[PDB]
Design a protein around this ligand. Structure first.
Ligand SMILES: [Mg+2]
Ligand SMILES: [Mg+2]
Ligand SMILES: [Mg+2]
Ligand SMILES: [Mg+2]
Ligand SMILES: [Mg+2]
Ligand SMILES: [Mg+2]
Ligand SMILES: [Mg+2]
Ligand SMILES: [Mg+2]
Ligand SMILES: [Mg+2]
Ligand SMILES: [Mg+2]
Ligand SMILES: [Mg+2]
Ligand SMILES: [Mg+2]
Ligand SMILES: [Mg+2]
Ligand SMILES: [Mg+2]
Ligand SMILES: [Mg+2]
Ligand SMILES: [Mg+2]
Ligand SMILES: [Mg+2]
Ligand SMILES: [Mg+2]
Ligand SMILES: [Mg+2]
Ligand SMILES: [Mg+2]
Ligand SMILES: [Mg+2]
Ligand SMILES: [Mg+2]
Ligand SMILES: [Mg+2]
Ligand SMILES: [Mg+2]
Ligand SMILES: [Mg+2]
Ligand SMILES: [Mg+2]
Ligand SMILES: [Mg+2]
Ligand SMILES: [Mg+2]
Ligand SMILES: [Mg+2]
Ligand SMILES: [Mg+2]
Ligand SMILES: [Mg+2]
Ligand SMILES: [Mg+2]
Ligand SMILES: [Mg+2]
Ligand SMILES: [Mg+2]
Ligand SMILES: [Mg+2]
Ligand SMILES: [Mg+2]
Ligand SMILES: [Mg+2]
Ligand SMILES: [Mg+2]
Ligand SMILES: [Mg+2]
Ligand SMILES: [Mg+2]
Ligand SMILES: [Mg+2]
Ligand SMILES: [Mg+2]
Ligand SMILES: [Mg+2]
Ligand SMILES: [Mg+2]
Ligand SMILES: [Mg+2]
Ligand SMILES: [Mg+2]
Ligand SMILES: [Mg+2]
Ligand SMILES: [Mg+2]
Ligand SMILES: [Mg+2]
Ligand SMILES: [Mg+2]
Ligand SMILES: [Mg+2]
Ligand SMILES: [Mg+2]
Ligand SMILES: [Mg+2]
Ligand SMILES: [Mg+2]
Ligand SMILES: [Mg+2]
Ligand SMILES: [Mg+2]
Ligand SMILES: [Mg+2]
Ligand SMILES: [Mg+2]
Ligand SMILES: [Mg+2]
Ligand SMILES: [Mg+2]
Ligand SMILES: [Mg+2]
Ligand SMILES: [Mg+2]
Lengths: 142, 150, 129
RNA sequence: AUAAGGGAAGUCGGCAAAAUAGAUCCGUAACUUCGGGAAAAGGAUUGGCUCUAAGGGUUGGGCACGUUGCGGCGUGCGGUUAACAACCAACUUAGAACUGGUACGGACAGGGGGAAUCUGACUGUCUAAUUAAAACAUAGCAUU
RNA sequence: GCGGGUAAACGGCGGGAGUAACUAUGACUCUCUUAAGGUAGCCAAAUGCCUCGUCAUCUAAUUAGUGACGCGCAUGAAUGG
RNA sequence: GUAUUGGCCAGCCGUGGUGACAACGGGUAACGGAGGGUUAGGGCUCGACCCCGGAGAAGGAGCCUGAGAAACGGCUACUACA
RNA sequence: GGUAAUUCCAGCUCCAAUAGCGUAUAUUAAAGUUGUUGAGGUUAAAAAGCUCGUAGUUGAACCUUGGGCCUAGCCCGCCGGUACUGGCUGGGCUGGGCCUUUCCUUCUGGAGAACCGCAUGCCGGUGUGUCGGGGAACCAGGACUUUUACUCUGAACAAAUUAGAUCGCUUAAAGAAGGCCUAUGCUUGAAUACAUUAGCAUGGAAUAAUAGAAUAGGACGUGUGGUUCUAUUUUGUUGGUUUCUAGGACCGCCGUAAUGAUUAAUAGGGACAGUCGGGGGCGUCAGUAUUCAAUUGUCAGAGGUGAAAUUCUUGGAUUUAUUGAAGACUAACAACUGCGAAAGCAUUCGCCAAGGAUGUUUUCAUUAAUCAGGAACGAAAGUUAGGGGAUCGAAGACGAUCAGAUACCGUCGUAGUCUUAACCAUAAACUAUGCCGAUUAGGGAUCGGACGGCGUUUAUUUUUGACCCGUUCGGCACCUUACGAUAAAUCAAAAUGUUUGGGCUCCUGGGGGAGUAUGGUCGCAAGGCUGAAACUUAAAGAAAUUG
RNA sequence: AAAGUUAUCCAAACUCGGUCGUUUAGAGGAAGUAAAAGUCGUAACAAGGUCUCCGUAGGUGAACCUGCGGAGGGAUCAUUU
């Protein structure tokens, strides 16, 4: 309540709606385009990279485990990020300098589960596909 | 309520339903007008000419008695004041407050009153200017305005 | 200050009827108000009404007989073509069978159903059902 | 006084010398006690000859009668020349064409500049005959 | 002589031991000591012996210059910072 | 001067023009439109792409012929590649 | 998931869609979590400290209504009949003509009707015509007519697309095709509506704006004079001149006419009368108290605390009485009481200007409401220069307590606390509740003004003042109740809201980072105003219930 | 009527300086967030053992303490001649 209601006040309503519409966070991040600037992906869905080392990260307090993530250096723009490796026993397959392919967790830039500070997951290694290699549908080329 | 206040009073006067003179008035419109013109030349403004005639002798409503308005009579007889009486009194009051203020430098309350009075003068002058009683180039300049009143 | 004497009249009628009174008093009276009352009367929603004539503006005293649910006013007078007039009846009427929306047109102010019969449009001023 | 190429490699140290310099027009940073810094930094033009334009002063304005020997007057009474005519007079500023061994503040006269630190606020004063400074004084502040 | 006041009066304004799930340091604690134990600030500065202190910058190369660090032989508040 | 009007240009003379009803400037991962996606109604978002209009042929400028070109499967010059 | 795992690794069995199913990113619904329709602002995120005021938005009522006849079209019922006809003295509904004081502009030309008679011819009507009295309607041309917004109907506007009609491509997504006996043939379709902003015409005349007669500079007349310009054909032709006539502009005299001004808003401004208040400014008067000083009497303790000490004392402390000086402050009366825009305002009296409410058969006549930027005031503390400096007392120095005590307790004590001339502009600046306007329920108190009344009291006494009863206007508040509202506490507004629109301005969108960094702007400074992002998290938070 | 030539115009390209925009190295200084069985105290929630909070100013290892003026979101809706 308290809006202008006259028949010639369309400008005030349009200006107020445009100004107050910035308080939304999804729209504010859309207008400023942080994905184009700050996001590791240049507003894309996937990205290609080079594996540098394998690192283990401890789970949060209620849980207790080592999640066995991995370090990756991006080919597209050369910055270095950390990504997760899922399922079980997959760490053996991915060697050093293996040209991995990455994707998101679906949390849209936020940590998933008890895994701290990891926003990406490995989809392919040596261009074969992790899940297909896991089920022994293919053999990793040397 | 009011332009510069918080009061909500309703004190006023109620005009009777009848628009005809009482049967005991026995005064013609032709005779009555000369008392108005004599008093106007003696110096009384239209504001209290009506109240003095009303209290002293006879006429209660000049409009009902003569069919014409009181100010209109003076204007048609060439006795209308050059400036309206309400603006004249507002100017006089603003001058008197300014005169007190210059002696009393730190009366912040009278300074506040003066801002309201001048803003009311400007608002009323805008109406008179846009209706044509005063010339469009008339301006309220505070320095020599004291001569207009007297 | 007073910006809608029509709104004041309908609000006072609605309050008295909802609280169960039988008579209503309206301080300002106007031609649009009386023309609205005649429309209500022609459909039986009210009874006698009287306009006392003081020289200022006159007053209104309406006689109620129940049977009235609500009567409201739309304050911004929109412009409605004839083709979209059914949007409003879909919007602010409980059902199409009964209820009336009051319009103002070049042929006087009138309800939306015979106004449709007259094949005319104009501006919207209120409603009652 | 002048020197090819290099341009402080000399020396305690750019000591001495060189480079800039007038006027007209553009352009001008950090900082700041908002007064300055500022001629900041950094650019363009400059002769001779033949022309054009602008900037002033002085004297003149209609009828109608009466003295004085066409004139000075005395008057009475109208118009504002859609500003005209003649004469007189020095300098200061702007613009155009042509011209030359591309030169022209042609001699004289005539600021090198920038980024920072230490120290005294400034102008001023003193060891005449080896020391002119950070020394003294100063306005301001405080005490007896 | 005895008893008070006064520092924009002359001037002054400390040492030794332990101590934090590596190492280092010491927020913390005991102890001697008197008029008070250098506060706000500042620094190899015209004030630092060890000293050409250590790190960065400037150079092909710098005991010089500048910016930082501070248990400061022996900085410091109208002896003005 | 141009096919013609026009501060398009050359001379002389005035001091103007736009703006809080948002001028001027900065961003655009911006060719515009017909239109695509999603629905009670109102809307939100996309539109390089078969239809219409505009622009370009590595980056700038200049020009002949011809009714029609500042053309690049036409020419001249510079820069960068080759 | 820490030794019997319905959730991991496997085997059985089962579930969902199915030639398809999962994952990532983007976008819409879900989202009444962007809210014009339609969102919160007492306590959950959020009404600027307060007022004035410009752009901007919004603005009280009032001017031709009704009635009386006639008629056209369109539905419904009924009375029968046969798609279907008269009807019914039917009832509605749309529309078009006249009289009611109103009715409907005007001239020229076209063709020509209706009503009339003239004679000529048939079975009380007609061709009749080369008849005119006469033009219902219509057409073409000229002049006059307040102007916008709004709505109705037209015109003009792309193919594709969207909706949508037709035809069995074997159905369908598509396509614009096809169909008919047997044909050396015939026939059809390839529609239609919407767009919607701007521009062009037509009808309507409510709603919302605008113009007109007040120094008459007003309307009309074949009334009557002027002075200026223009000039069609008629007197053979040409040139010049004049009269009459026709038109335009302008100015007098006279006559004609009902000769021209809406109310006075429980809108607003102003005037007047008796009052009211701790509203503001300057000056002045008084009061005890605290501290200090002088005089006076006596003699051993006085202060302070839960308990002590630091401190002062026969150099007479503390205490008693009298006098003097200085600065600050106005007790009791003092309240569910008053005034001011808020911050705020309390001893007497004099002077100066200002204000609310009431009363009023005064005056003007829409002058109004809220406001982006902009402006005035703005507790306490703080800053810059003078005066003053009693009391308290940041900083500081001591005495106790305590394991420690840079504190809470006690004795001192600087800036400050007061005032004059200038800055600063923030507070839990709180009713945590914006401003204007309308309506809604019972009660009794109370402050100011006015009106009515029976009495008491009292005075150089009456009328006045004090007390009592009842009504009304305007305030600061209170008790009960819920038809109502909310999550609830609670509310006469926080009501009249899913049955959602009286007008205006501002602010908020999970919690942190953060009122931080940076830029700009004001200030002597302290600081004020404006105000992000990276990153991180599944909960923070409100009201109430049992412990 | 070709080469050549004089003076304007349209002007690519290069050099030097100024200005705006984006990215990025840096001794040292000073914050935030998370993970901890770390050290020192106990400020707040009960009258949290000195009622809590707001504006302003000063001080101390740290939470914090003290002065002035406010608020109840309090531990009081209340005391008579
Ligand atoms: Mg107001
Ligand atoms: Mg009122
Ligand atoms: Mg040489
Ligand atoms: Mg040489
Ligand atoms: Mg050189
Ligand atoms: Mg050498
Ligand atoms: Mg050398
Ligand atoms: Mg030299
Ligand atoms: Mg220079
Ligand atoms: Mg300089
Ligand atoms: Mg020359
Ligand atoms: Mg030179
Ligand atoms: Mg000096
Ligand atoms: Mg000497
Ligand atoms: Mg010398
Ligand atoms: Mg000296
Ligand atoms: Mg150790
Ligand atoms: Mg120190
Ligand atoms: Mg040192
Ligand atoms: Mg040195
Ligand atoms: Mg150094
Ligand atoms: Mg060195
Ligand atoms: Mg050197
Ligand atoms: Mg020393
Ligand atoms: Mg010293
Ligand atoms: Mg020293
Ligand atoms: Mg202008
Ligand atoms: Mg582009
Ligand atoms: Mg396109
Ligand atoms: Mg082209
Ligand atoms: Mg080309
Ligand atoms: Mg090609
Ligand atoms: Mg081509
Ligand atoms: Mg098991
Ligand atoms: Mg098991
Ligand atoms: Mg919400
Ligand atoms: Mg809260
Ligand atoms: Mg809150
Ligand atoms: Mg109205
Ligand atoms: Mg189809
Ligand atoms: Mg009134
Ligand atoms: Mg004694
Ligand atoms: Mg005193
Ligand atoms: Mg009182
Ligand atoms: Mg008192
Ligand atoms: Mg404002
Ligand atoms: Mg103050
Ligand atoms: Mg003070
Ligand atoms: Mg001084
Ligand atoms: Mg002072
Ligand atoms: Mg104390
Ligand atoms: Mg004390
Ligand atoms: Mg605030
Ligand atoms: Mg508030
Ligand atoms: Mg408020
Ligand atoms: Mg009485
Ligand atoms: Mg919670
Ligand atoms: Mg709670
Ligand atoms: Mg940096
Ligand atoms: Mg670092
Ligand atoms: Mg506490
Ligand atoms: Mg509580």
């Amino acid at each position: 309540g308290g809006k202008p209601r006259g028949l010639n006040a369309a400008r005030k309503l349009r200006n107020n709606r445009r100004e107050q519409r910035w308080a939304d966070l999804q729209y504010k991040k859309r207008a400023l385009g942080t994905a184009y600037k700050s996001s590791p992906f240049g507003g894309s869905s996937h990205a290609k990279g080079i594996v540098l080392e394998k690192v283990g990260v401890e789970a949060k307090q209620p849980n207790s485990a080592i999640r066995k993530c991995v370090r990756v250096q991006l080919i597209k723009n050369g910055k270095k990020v950390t990504a997760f490796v899922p399922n079980d026993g997959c760490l053996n397959f991915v060697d050093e300098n293996d040209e991995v392919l990455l994707a998101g967790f679906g949390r849209k830039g936020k940590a998933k589960g008890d895994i701290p500070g990891v926003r990406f997951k490995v989809v392919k290694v040596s261009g074969v596909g992790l899940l297909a290699l896991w089920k022994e549908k293919k053999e990793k080329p040397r | 309520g009011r332009l510069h206040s918080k009061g909500k009073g309703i004190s006023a006067s109620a005009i009777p339903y009848s628009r005809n003179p009482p049967a005991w008035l026995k005064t013609t419109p032709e005779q009555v007008v000369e008392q108005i013109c004599k008093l106007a030349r003696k110096g009384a403004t239209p504001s209290q000419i009506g109240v003095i005639l009303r209290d002293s002798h006879g006429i209660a409503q000049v409009k009902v008695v003569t069919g014409n308005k009181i100010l209109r009579i003076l204007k048609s007889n060439g006795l209308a004041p050059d400036i309206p009486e309400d603006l004249y009194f507002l100017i006089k009051k603003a001058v008197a407050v300014r005169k007190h203020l210059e002696r009393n430098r730190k009366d912040k309350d009278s300074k506040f009153r003066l801002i309201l009075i001048e803003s009311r003068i400007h608002r009323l002058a805008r109406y008179y200017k846009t209706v044509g009683v005063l010339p469009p180039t008339w301006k309220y300049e505070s320095s020599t305005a004291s001569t207009l009143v007297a | 200050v007073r910006t809608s004497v029509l709104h004041d009249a309908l609000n006072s009628i609605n309050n008295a009827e909802k609280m169960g009174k039988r008579q209503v008093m309206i301080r300002p009276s106007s031609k649009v108000i009386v023309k609205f009352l005649q429309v209500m009367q022609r459909h039986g929603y009210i009874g006698e009404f009287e306009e006392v004539d003081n020289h200022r503006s006159g007053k209104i005293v309406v006689q109620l007989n129940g049977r009235l649910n609500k009567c409201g006013v739309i304050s911004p007078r929109y412009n409605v073509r004839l083709a979209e007039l059914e949007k409003w009846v879909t919007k602010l009427l409980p059902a199409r069978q009964f209820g009336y929306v009051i319009l103002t047109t070049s042929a006087g102010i009138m309800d939306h159903e015979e106004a449709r019969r007259k094949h005319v449009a104009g501006k919207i001023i209120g409603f009652f059902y």
